[PDB]
């Protein structure tokens, strides 16, 4: 199914092994799980 949008403050990045991860610029944190509204 489709991808719901990212919430404010979050960025989607890809690491040097090709793995998607998510960056929270409000918290200055990263995580694997896609955030949801």
């Amino acid at each position: 199914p489709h991808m719901p949008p990212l919430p404010p403050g979050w960025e989607e990045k890809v690491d040097n092994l090709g793995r998607t991860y998510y960056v929270n610029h409000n918290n200055r944190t990263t995580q694997w799980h896609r955030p949801s509204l």
């Binding site: 990045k13 690491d15 991860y21 998510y22 960056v23 610029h25 200055r28 944190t29 990263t30 694997w32």
Partner: peptide, 14 residues
């Protein structure tokens, strides 16, 4: 699951 945590936050951007 994944090998390791994800890359650290890009703190130099602060």
């Amino acid at each position: 699951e994944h090998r390791g945590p994800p890359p650290e936050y890009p703190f130099k951007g602060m």
